[PDB]
């Protein structure tokens, strides 16, 4: 077992699309440029993290194929590739492999440097291959060889017989170049070094002299913390959904739910409703949120009135029985209750308000039974002509249709986080990590940043503070009740200074507006982005890779604040010189008279006109599409 | 659980039984089969995974029947306290509701 450098090997066509004379970038599992590739000389099994790059160089027919899977045993499915002098066989079976195969004691069937790439993603096992006569430092792309639809789970693999190279692919962004033939002839790994990042940003393989803003460094979070109120009681949702009888819609029953842990996923067990109907929130995320208070409104209506339980609805139920606000945030759960609320002859216990003087405001209840005066003649509390009882009975019967069958409706109203939360999900809290860039979750408020002890004088009723951008910059811990400032993690723009690829590949990195001691020095790619790593301090920021000199020259590459950079074998930084030193010999009675002259011809270039461009909207926006043209005609 | 067969969904079926990708392109066809898959006393042939260590990736299948370790004490392949069988039976009955 040895280790070696992969150079710019490991490149395949990322699609079946013909492309020519183009610079195309993409994101895929690619073998990194100059990657730590393990060179095995021939026996434990090797892993399959995000794909494999395999290379062979042997003149004899020694390496016969490969074995893939997870445990290489008849409990699971394993994938076997064999080659001989006339045919290649691919097979998928629960083989009982030997620990040093060369194969087994006991589905899918398929019929000079040698490079192969194995990917296992999207239920497909893709094999790319290439043969290149003489790892070489040259560049060559791997054409796709086969695509197996097996969709097998793969975590370990081994070769089948003698030296071979093995590398592991990583999710990378690559900039490939397609020539006139349509063949990938060159590639750039966008995260290899600052020069490659500049090339990717400029979408070119050659960089002119200058300074370019490529990206911004950002310190990644180290931990994930969760802060929830210390609540152990379980919300009594069974008392609402599993009630023996429900109230009428005119007198809908409201249940207060607070100081408990709500597990909405169990609600499906309580009632046989088909699906949720939530507004301003998803039923999927209900377990991840906190609420100040929860209100469960229970009633029974007709099926055709179920659509009336929604924001912005009118009708008898909405106007006079139960009204939801336009900005309602919550869920509506309605299920058929024909077997429980309908009897032979008519169930007349359930009633709804039919007449009222004015429409109800949201979340208003009216249990008055006074006689409604339809006309102008007073009723004097006696029902009769133009004076009807305000409540009408449903009279549910089992023989009625689905639109007339009774439906039990429970409306869950959620109060968003403004006061201390009392209803929370089953999410478990963690410790309150301070002074570190972490991911935090305060009562459902999710963010990333550094939490520090706050000096802000929060009033007792206040729970969080917001900045100019209406984002939470201070928060009160639900358990310790202390105020914490939230500051975004260390970040800053990065500029790359290069003398031009035609001159040298050396580059300098300027972290803009960043103190030189604040430059990240993380040794792990997961703790800082970009993954590449590379000292003078200027008012423009921290410059790394350029040697400051005391001499002064004309500004070549403007860094800023009077600092410029130049290429002199290495990149140097200096203070730009304003001009040559001079001193006029002034005197009370001294003059300078010219005795010669020079006829000087200078050149001044002035632009006069630019290119005249005509644009046709129909072709650009639509391009011979009648439907698109008709839709575009509506834009005026 | 029919609503769980959709992109971006979580829940028992989506997390541990059948997961669709966010960029899923296709169709989902679900129809009631009460007359064919429900029997008096309970049809216990149909099961779903209730416990798993991690959420499934899209288009992944898990047929393992190993005991799930809910707590920190190893189960040693024996079901008991904080160690339950990962598969739970539906027990469909004709008297059940549409949900």
């Amino acid at each position: 077992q040895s280790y070696t450098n992969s150079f710019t090997r490991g490149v395949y066509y990322p699609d079946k699309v013909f492309r020519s004379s183009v610079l195309h970038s993409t994101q895929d599992l690619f073998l990194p440029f100059f990657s730590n590739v393990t060179w095995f000389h021939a026996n434990p099994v090797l892993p399959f993290n995000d794909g494999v790059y395999f290379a062979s160089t042997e003149k004899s027919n020694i390496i016969r194929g490969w074995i893939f899977g997870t445990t290489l045993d008849s409990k699971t499915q394993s994938l076997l590739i064999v080659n001989n002098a006339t045919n290649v066989v691919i097979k998928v079976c629960e083989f009982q492999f030997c620990n040093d195969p060369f194969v087994y004691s006991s589905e899918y069937v398929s019929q000079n440097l040698r490079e192969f790439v194995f990917k296992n993603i999207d239920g497909y096992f893709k094999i790319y291959s290439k043969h290149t006569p003489i790892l070489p430092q040259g560049f060559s792309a791997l054409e796709p060889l086969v695509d197996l639809p097996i969709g097998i789970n793969i975590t370990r693999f081994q070769t089948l017989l003698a030296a071979y190279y093995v590398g592991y692919l990583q999710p990378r962004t690559f900039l490939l170049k397609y020539n006139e033939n349509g063949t990938i002839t060159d590639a750039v790994d966008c995260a290899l070094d600052p020069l490659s990042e500049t090339k990717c940003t400029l979408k070119s393989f050659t960089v002119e002299k200058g300074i370019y803003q490529t990206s911004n460094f950002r310190v990644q979070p180290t931990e994930s913390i969760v802060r929830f109120p210390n609540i152990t009681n379980l919300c009594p949702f069974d008392e609402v959904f599993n009630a023996t009888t429900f109230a009428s819609v005119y007198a809908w029953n409201r249940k207060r739910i607070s100081n408990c842990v709500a597990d909405y996923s169990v609600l499906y067990n309580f009632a046989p409703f088909f699906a949720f109907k939530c507004y301003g929130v998803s039923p999927t995320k209900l377990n991840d949120l906190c609420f100040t208070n929860v209100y469960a409104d229970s009633f029974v209506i007709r099926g055709n009135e179920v659509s009336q339980i929604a924001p912005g609805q009118t009708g008898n139920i909405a106007d006079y029985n139960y009204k939801l606000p336009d900005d309602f945030t919550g869920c509506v759960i309605a299920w058929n209750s024909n077997k429980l609320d309908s009897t032979v002859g008519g169930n007349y216990n359930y009633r709804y308000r039919l007449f009222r003087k004015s429409k109800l405001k949201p979340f208003e209840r009216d249990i008055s039974t006074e006689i409604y005066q339809a006309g102008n003649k007073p009723c004097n509390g006696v029902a009769g002509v133009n004076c009807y009882f305000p409540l009408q009975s449903y009279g549910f019967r089992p023989t009625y249709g689905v639109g007339h069958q009774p439906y039990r409706v429970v409306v869950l109203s959620f109060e968003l986080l403004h006061a201390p939360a009392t209803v929370c999900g089953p999410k478990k809290s963690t410790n309150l990590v301070k002074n570190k860039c972490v991911n935090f979750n305060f009562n459902g408020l999710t963010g990333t940043g550094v939490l520090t002890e706050s000096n802000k004088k929060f009033l007792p009723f206040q729970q969080f503070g917001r900045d100019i951008a209406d984002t939470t910059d201070a928060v009160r811990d639900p358990q310790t009740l202390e105020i914490l400032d939230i500051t975004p993690c260390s970040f800053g723009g990065v500029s790359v200074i290069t003398p031009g690829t035609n001159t040298s590949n050396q580059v300098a990195v300027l972290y803009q507006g960043v103190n030189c001691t604040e430059v990240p020095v993380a040794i792990h790619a997961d703790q800082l982005t970009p993954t590449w790593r590379v000292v003078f301090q200027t008012r423009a920021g921290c410059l790394i890779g350029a040697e400051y000199v005391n001499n002064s020259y004309e500004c070549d590459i403007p860094i800023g604040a009077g600092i410029c950079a130049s290429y002199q074998q290495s990149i140097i930084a200096y203070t730009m010189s304003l001009g040559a030193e001079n001193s006029v010999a002034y005197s009370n009675n001294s003059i300078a008279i010219p005795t010669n002259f020079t006829i000087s011809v200078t050149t001044e270039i002035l632009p006069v006109s630019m290119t005249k461009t005509s644009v046709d909207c129909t072709m650009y926006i639509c391009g011979d599409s009648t439907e698109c043209s008709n839709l575009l005609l509506q834009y005026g | 659980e029919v609503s769980q067969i959709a992109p971006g969904q979580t829940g028992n079926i989506a997390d541990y039984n059948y997961k669709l990708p966010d960029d899923f392109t296709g169709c989902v066809i679900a129809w009631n089969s009460n007359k064919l898959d429900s029997t008096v006393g309970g049809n216990y042939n149909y099961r779903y995974r209730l416990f798993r260590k991690s959420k499934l990736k899209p288009f992944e299948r898990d047929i393992s029947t190993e005991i799930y370790q809910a707590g920190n004490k190893p189960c040693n392949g024996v079901a008991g306290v904080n160690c339950y069988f990962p598969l739970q039976s539906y027990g469909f009955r004709p008297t059940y509701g549409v949900g």
Partner: antibody
Amino acid sequence: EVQLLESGGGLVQPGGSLRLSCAASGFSFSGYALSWVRQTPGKGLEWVSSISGSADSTYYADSVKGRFTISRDNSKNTFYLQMSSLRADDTAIYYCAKPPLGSNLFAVGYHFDYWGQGTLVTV
Amino acid sequence: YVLTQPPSVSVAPGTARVTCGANNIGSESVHWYQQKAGQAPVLVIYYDRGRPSGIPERFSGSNSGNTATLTISRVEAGDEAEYYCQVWDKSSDHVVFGGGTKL
């Protein structure tokens, strides 16, 4: 104020057994994960064991794993360290330590804000 | 996980520096305790710069790169004690204490 009191420390023969008890007051006992930390005279501190608030999880150092056993009684606001097969190196001053609120879980941010008086145990 | 501390440190009265070294210690929360002669340890620093109430403002903390630093400005006669750095190893669930520094 928060108060921690150790007891049970004394003289024990090598290879014997002993039990330390720490009584706690001034805080919600059921919500804090308590610790036992020992120090040999003339040496540095060394964490011994830890128990969670619900007593559903126990943690032991590799140097005392199997020999020691931590337990707690929330109804009595006490927690105990029962050690057996004590070696000669186990002679030390033992402290029962409590974490502050917000770091009371045995997790990344676990640390101690209050320490007990401690008891000397000689093997 | 192993925490490395100097055996001792000396400084003139009235700028003391104590260092706790470990691999990738910048991603770990480091807490500093002070223990006098025959007294229980007292937390002086938490979360690499957090100072509890009642502790003199002389004590300050930092944690970066591969080292955590506890700085005592204008060290008095009563500040001579043993200082310990402590972390919680994520990979093993062990409470790891420092070697110990006396000044």
